[PDB]
Design a protein around this ligand. Sequence first.
Ligand SMILES: Cn1nn[nH+]c1CC(=O)N[NH3+]
Ligand code: NI
Ligand code: NI
Ligand SMILES: [Zn+2]
Length: 330
Amino acid sequence: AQNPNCNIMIFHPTKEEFNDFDKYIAYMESQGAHRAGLAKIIPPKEWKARETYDNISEILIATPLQQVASGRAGVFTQYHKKKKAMTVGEYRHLANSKKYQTPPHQNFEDLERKYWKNRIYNSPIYGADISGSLFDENTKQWNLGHLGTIQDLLEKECGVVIEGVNTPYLYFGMWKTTFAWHTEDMDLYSINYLHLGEPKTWYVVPPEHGQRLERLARELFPGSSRGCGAFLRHKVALISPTVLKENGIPFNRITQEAGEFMVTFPYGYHAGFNHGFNCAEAINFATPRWIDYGKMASQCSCGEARVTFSMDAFVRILQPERYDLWKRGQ
Ligand SMILES: Cn1nn[nH+]c1CC(=O)N[NH3+]
Ligand code: NI
Ligand code: NI
Ligand SMILES: [Zn+2]
């Protein structure tokens, strides 16, 4: 078996290898990459996502979200408070202000220490789930707006045509903005490209051990667990690496820098934080190997995690017994 310790693998495709997206994901899996839950892909030196980022300041962030924490430093939840609209240029200036800017630090380890020590005491603002793309139309390789759609994958694999679409999203981050522990909707894959700015640190549990994280989360967030059998789908819970280690949860960590892709694999729980002002683009995707994960994916039906109407068909087709109850959630 490849990659038995479930380490995060890093890939360096050549420009020839970067032509066929699906073929390369399959190659990474052949080497055991999915066992970690997460992989890093560094693009060939000849590739570029777009010519410059000099003209992105007028993009609007319609609903910036202030991420307010409750709990303790290593075990906390966050809720999102809506703020007034601001442009990307306005947001950048805010992220760089004295109130929000990254503190002085020695290296990524020292900043990680400061994140986990002090996160709960601040409420950073972030731009999320902004439909759009910053890839140039003429970037032909690994353009996140041009990948096979999940609908088309389901049709190709299972024979039925369904409604829905699958487009990318933009994320604007600042120091301490946080992504809570979760898997993707329907336990899909994700791909994430860090366009511009400061890094993003990631934490990931191997898919084979996801239920260990779930069990710990039910112990650490008992009221939430009583409220919903799939509360992690609410995307509000954080557990620090120190608490994970104390509890024996297998995980790994890695820092993504601008110009790098990260791929999350089905049922790979992940969480993380931004080092400073940055912009990422992400989209969910499927492969044939996903179908079995989508059939088994847990669902939130308490109401709290509402999602894409594109997800309706996936539940309807892959999980017909659950459909009725889930549809009520939405
Ligand atoms: C969103 N996003 N963009 N880059 N990284 C992320 C975090 C994530 O949860 N991806 N699935
Ligand atoms: Ni396009
Ligand atoms: Ni994710
Ligand atoms: Zn729920």
